[PDB]
Every structure is written in structure tokens, then in C-alpha cells.
Amino acid sequence: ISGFQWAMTIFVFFVITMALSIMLRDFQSIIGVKHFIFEVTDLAPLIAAIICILVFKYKKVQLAGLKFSISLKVIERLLLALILPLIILIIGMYSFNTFADSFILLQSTGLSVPITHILIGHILMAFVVEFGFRSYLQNIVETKMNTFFASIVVGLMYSVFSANTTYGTEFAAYNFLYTFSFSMILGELIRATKGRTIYIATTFHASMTFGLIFLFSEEIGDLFSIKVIAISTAIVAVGYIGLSLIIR
Amino acid sequence: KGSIFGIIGLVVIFAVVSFLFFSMISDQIFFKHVKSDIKIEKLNVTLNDAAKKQINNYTSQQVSNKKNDAWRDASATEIKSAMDSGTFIDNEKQKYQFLDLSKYQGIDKNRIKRMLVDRPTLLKHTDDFLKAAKDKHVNEVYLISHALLETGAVKSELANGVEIDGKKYYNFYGVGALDKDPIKTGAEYAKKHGWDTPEKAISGGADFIHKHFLSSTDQNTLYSMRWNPKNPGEHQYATDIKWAESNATIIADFYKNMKTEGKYFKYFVYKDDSKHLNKKLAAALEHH
């Protein structure tokens, strides 16, 4: 709870996540998988959290949001972690049918990899990223600010980690808006969990990425596609954040 | 704290939201059946007398030999099997020899857009294709697949526009493009018809396809274009005897990749089959 340990934990975790995200770039054929299934760069926040947990004191606070136990609140949060991806995929479908050229499912695209290999890969990508960003980093920031501002801080760091400047700066702006809203939803999805946040965070992260690739795989790189996704995610974000604020 | 009634409320929302999710992916998983409108046209010529008229007076019926490099004359038995319209009825792919290529069916726009996913030039003008197929009375599946094959490797470069002086002309159906020079002859044809915009190339070519190949009602289907059962051996669109079967497979496979089927069919009945038909209809409809 020390002010120094808080700032260094924020600093240490961030710099080693970004450092490993670049150091693991060349190390792409050391797991026996291709990027389509599992991006090795997603192990950067996982290793970052494990190293921070060891180099810092107060292991009780370090492992606060790592509650592996099934609880009735997380079961309730688990099905919320399924609705919110489903509603965003719905808004994306209507936008693609109405304003674009529809969408194609993954199974009808001539895949050289089984669909189970992809689903298992997106779950493990969801597990390692949320283990370090929401199960560890979130409750660390939550020791000095409430869930809202803690979600804003983890949102900025996750968006830098998930930054995508491949398709231009305008595409990266809307992808930034999507990953930022992606973090505000999960900050609320794991609010007041008594730590039991791994299952909530991985269920939402996996359903999101797999739901996007299973439905909008033919839309990769389209500036209009990242716009409606960023907007549909932000619209569902402000509604879910606004809902849980007035009942509060 | 942990709650049990909040779970029931969310299992309920989970079932509802998953229902609308499935209700929007149902188009791309389940077969869409279409009620068929089949026109049955009785003929005065028997199948034997129609086969006789294909065997001798024209005798331009070609067949690719086992080498698949040279054409030869078709046998009398080979012509008989290729023109027996009764064998193609219970066939899944060859039933489209009888598809009325002149009747716009009205297939969902999203189904067509999903087929042109790897052809961005044709996907941009999906609306122009469907508007033309309906205004110019051409089957949209036939109009599209023709534009797909007539805009191949060197021909799609003609679909994006050829710079001629200070104008760029488009040709989406490869019409007027001779085998000597497909881009040059194709662009010169589009320049004489004022196809300076893609929309003009879509409608004008669909207008050309209807006025040049769908003029006579007696030759609407692929079968009647190849064998002309109302005038056997005469105004026939091809010499290859597998021509009607090769195009029908292209049409049938296009329909299968969209998870739907054709609607308007026109089948011609030879004289020998037309005897036991009219008696069976009256028998199966009237019951005293």
C-alpha cells in the first residue's frame, strides 16, 4: 500500500510488458504454433505479473485479484461476460448487413486449421493477458483509486499493448477506442468480486476475439469495420457502465 | 454478495441474446428452400425423331476425345444420352439445364455479396448487377457467373477500365472481346456503346445478354439453347454435346455455395412422354 511500491509496481509491470512484447516478436517459432492460434507476444503481461509478484512485497496484496475459487457472484458475472460480447457482435452484424457487404462465418472460408485449435488458442491468449492486466494490474491500481479510474489506467496501458498501427494512424485511433472500451467493461465485470476475477476476465476476452474472428474474419483491416466495432463496443461500454452506476 | 435469483435473470438474458445471435447466422448454416414454378411444354416431335434430326442434317455435334486436345464427331448413342431430357430431371446438378435463365429470381442481396467476397470490383457493383438482372430479365445467378468467367485474369483488367485517349471504358461481361486481343477488342466494343461508367457496362451488357441469347421463349433454358426441342438441330448455341451439362454444373454449384436453389424451371416434354402424362394428372387430381 506504500506510495513508492504502488508507482514502481505500475512502472515495472508496464516497461517489462512492453519490453517483452518486442523481445518475443522474433521468438515466434518456439512454441510449436502459428500466430493465428496463439500470439507468443501475449505472454508479455503474464511474465510481467509473475516477476512483479516476486520482486515486490505484500504477497497477500499481490495475489488479491487472483481468486481461483468458484463463487455465486462470479457465476453471475460469467454470464454477463457472455452477454456483452454477444450484444456487440449483434450490433456489428446489423451494421455490416445494413451499411456494408454482410459477413462470412469462419467455417465457410476454407480453413487449414481446425476450429477447435483456434478456439483453444483464443482462450489461452485470453487467459495469459487477463491474468496480468486484470487479475493482477487492475487490483493493484484499485488499491489507490476506485474501479472507474483504475479501469481508465489499465485501459491506457492495455491499448498501448494492443496498439495496431499496421493499417495507418486512423485505423489505430479507432482500434485504440475499441481496446480502451474493452478494458472499461471488464473493470466493471470484475468489480467487487472478492478477487475471483480470472474466470470473468478470460470468458469475456476469449468470447470477444473469437467472436470477432468467427464472424468478421473477411473484414480484417477495413477502416469501416474497426469503426463500427469500436463504436459498438463503446456504446455497450457506456451503457453497462452507466447502468451499474445508477443502481449503485 | 452471491445470489441465485440474479443467475436466473441472466440465464434468461443469455437464452434471449443467444437466440437473436443464432437468428442472424441462420442464413449461412441452413438450407433455404424455394418453391419451384415449373413450366411444362408439350412437344409434337418424339425423342427418336428429335435424335434423328440431330444425327444427320447438321452433324456438327462435337466431343472432346480422351486426349482432351481435339474435337471429333459425336456418336449416335452419345447424342442420344446427351439430349435425353428425362434423365436430367432427378439429377441435382443437371436439373439446372431446365432453369429459365430469363426470369429474375430475386435472391437475397447478402447471399450474392458473400459470393463476390474475393472479387472487389464485382462486389462494389452487386446492386447494379441485381438491378440489371431484374430490369433486363436475366437470371441473376446466370448474369453473375457469366460476369465472373468473362472477367478472369486478363478480362477483369477490362472490368476496371481501359484508358482510351482521355476516357476509361468498362466491360463486365467480356462482350465484344475477341480471342485475338481480349482487352483491345473488348474496350473498343465498350467505347462504341458508351460504356464510360461501370453502371452503363453492367446494364448494357445485361441488356446484350437478354437481347442476344434470351430472345426466344422457346430457347430460355440451357437445354433448349443446346438442342432446341421446338426446332431440333437448327438454332443451337453450341456444338459440344456436353455444353448444356457443363454450364449447368457451373450454375448448380453457384446455387449450392449460396445454400439455396433455383425457382423458375421450364421443361420440354417430347411426344412419346406426353401420352401417359396428361392421363396421370387427371387421375391424381380428380377422385370422383
Swiss-Prot record, chain A:
Keywords noted in UniProt: Cell membrane, Cell wall, Membrane, Secreted, Transmembrane, Transmembrane helix
Summary of the function given for this chain in its UniProt record: Involved in bacterial cell envelope homeostasis. Regulates peptidoglycan processing by N-acetylglucosaminidase SagB, perhaps acting as a scaffold protein. Pleiotropic regulator of gene expression, probably acting via interactions with multiple two-component systems. Plays a role in the abundant deposition of the immunoglobulin G-binding protein A (spa) at the cross-wall, a subcellular structure that initially arises from cytokinesis.
Transmembrane spans: 4-24, 36-56, 79-99, 113-133, 148-168, 170-190, 197-217, 226-246
Disulfide feature: none
Subunit details: Interacts with N-acetylglucosaminidase SagB; interaction is direct and facilitates peptidoglycan processing. Interacts (via N-terminal region including transmembrane domains) with sensor protein kinase WalK (via N-terminal region including transmembrane domains). Interacts (via N-terminal region including transmembrane domains) with sensor protein kinase SaeS. Interacts with other histidine kinases, perhaps via their transmembrane domains.
Main location: membrane
Domain notes: C-terminal region not involved in glucosaminidase activity of the SagB-SpdC/LyrA complex.
Gene Ontology terms describing biological process: CAAX-box protein maturation
Gene Ontology cellular-component terms listed: plasma membrane
Family of this protein: Belongs to the LyrA family.
Molecular function per GO: endopeptidase activity
Annotated membrane topology: Multi-pass membrane protein
Subcellular compartments: Cell membrane; Secreted, Cell wall; Cell septum
Official protein name in the record: Lysostaphin resistance protein A
